[PDB]
Amino acid sequence: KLSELFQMLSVGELSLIRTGNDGQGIRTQDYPKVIAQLNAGLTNLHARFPLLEKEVIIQQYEQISKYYLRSEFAQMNTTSTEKYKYLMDSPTERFLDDVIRVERVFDECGCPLYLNNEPCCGSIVTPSFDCIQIVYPIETNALFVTYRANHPKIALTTTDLNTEVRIPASHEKALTYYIASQLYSNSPNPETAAKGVEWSQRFEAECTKIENLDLDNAHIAQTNVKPEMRGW
Amino acid sequence: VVIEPITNEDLTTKVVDGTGIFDELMTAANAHLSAQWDMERITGTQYAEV
Numbered sequence A: 001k002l003s004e005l006f007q008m009l010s011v012g013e014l015s016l017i018r019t020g021n022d023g024q025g026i027r028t029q030d031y032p033k034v035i036a037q038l039n040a041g042l043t044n045l046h047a048r049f050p051l052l053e054k055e056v057i058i059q060q061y062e063q064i065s066k067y068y069l070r071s072e073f074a075q076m077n078t079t080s081t082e083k084y085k086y087l088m089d090s091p092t093e094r095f096l097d098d099v100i101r102v103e104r105v106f107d108e109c110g111c112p113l114y115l116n117n118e119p120c121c122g123s124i125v126t127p128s129f130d131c132i133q134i135v136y137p138i139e140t141n142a143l144f145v146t147y148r149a150n151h152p153k154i155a156l157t158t159t160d161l162n163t164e165v166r167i168p169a170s171h172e173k174a175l176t177y178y179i180a181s182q183l184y185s186n187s188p189n190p191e192t193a194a195k196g197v198e199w200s201q202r203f204e205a206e207c208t209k210i211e212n213l214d215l216d217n218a219h220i221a222q223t224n225v226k227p228e229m230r231g232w
Numbered sequence B: 001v002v003i004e005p006i007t008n009e010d011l012t013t014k015v016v017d018g019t020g021i022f023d024e025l026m027t028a029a030n031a032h033l034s035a036q037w038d039m040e041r042i043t044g045t046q047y048a049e050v
Helices: A002-013 A018-023 A031-048 A172-184 A190-213 A226-230 B021-037 B044-049
Strands: A053-059 A066-068 A099-106 A131-133 A142-149
Touching: A002 A018, A002 A031, A002 A172, A031 A099, A031 A142, A031 A172, A172 A190
Parallel strands: none
Antiparallel strands: A053 A142, A066 A131, A099 A142
16 A cells, blocks of 8 residues: 555655654655656556556547547546547546557457558558548547557545555565665765665666566567478 | 843744744855855755865
8 A cells, every 4th residue: 555655665764764754654745746757657667567468449430530539528527528439448447548569459349450561451550649541431440559558647636545556476575676766866965865876776676686586477479380380 | 211131932932934043044054055056056955064
């Protein structure tokens, strides 16, 4: 939970600094400063490691060819006045703007489609960082975009400490070292800047350790299918 | 004239913006420091160091 992370930061890592309040808990006024750094740390960990991969269904409309990955066009977000909401969200999968990289794209039946392929004029291109361009949209089709997902963003004004930070206990130290590095690096004092650099190096060492141990089952080899494809 | 006793509260009020003489001298030095710092001439670390 966020309370545990705040206590851990207050005593042990952010101890000899103002934000830690001498190990008596993070002040209720410095929340929008640890939370901003925490969002960056969670984004870094969720982009460098595959801690959350999710899929989103994009319903194709006859007059729309550029589909934006924004919650304003979501089926569950009822606050938006968009006439056509092509994102197909469910109470289970909500699509809270947590998109880090669009990896794979499928169709309604389940056949993979090419992504960003120029020679094949049947591929789904990506114009901008959050858009999906379908040159050939059909009113009776739906996409099945799968992406690497981010942690649901914790608002800067969040006050409830029961908001759960969903990271494995192995990356707790990596996140904490990242937060310490980011908070220690703001000041231009050489002595404090050196500590910030040391925290950055230690965070990059923890990440290297987790990569070397593959605690998230990311770098796992697959069955070779090249002989079958080449006709052996 | 009425002379007043010299007490501890005439030197330091134990507050940063105190009414003492040392506090007023600190406020005056901090005024020049803030005037220089408002022109991006010194960083916060150097501000506190001086």
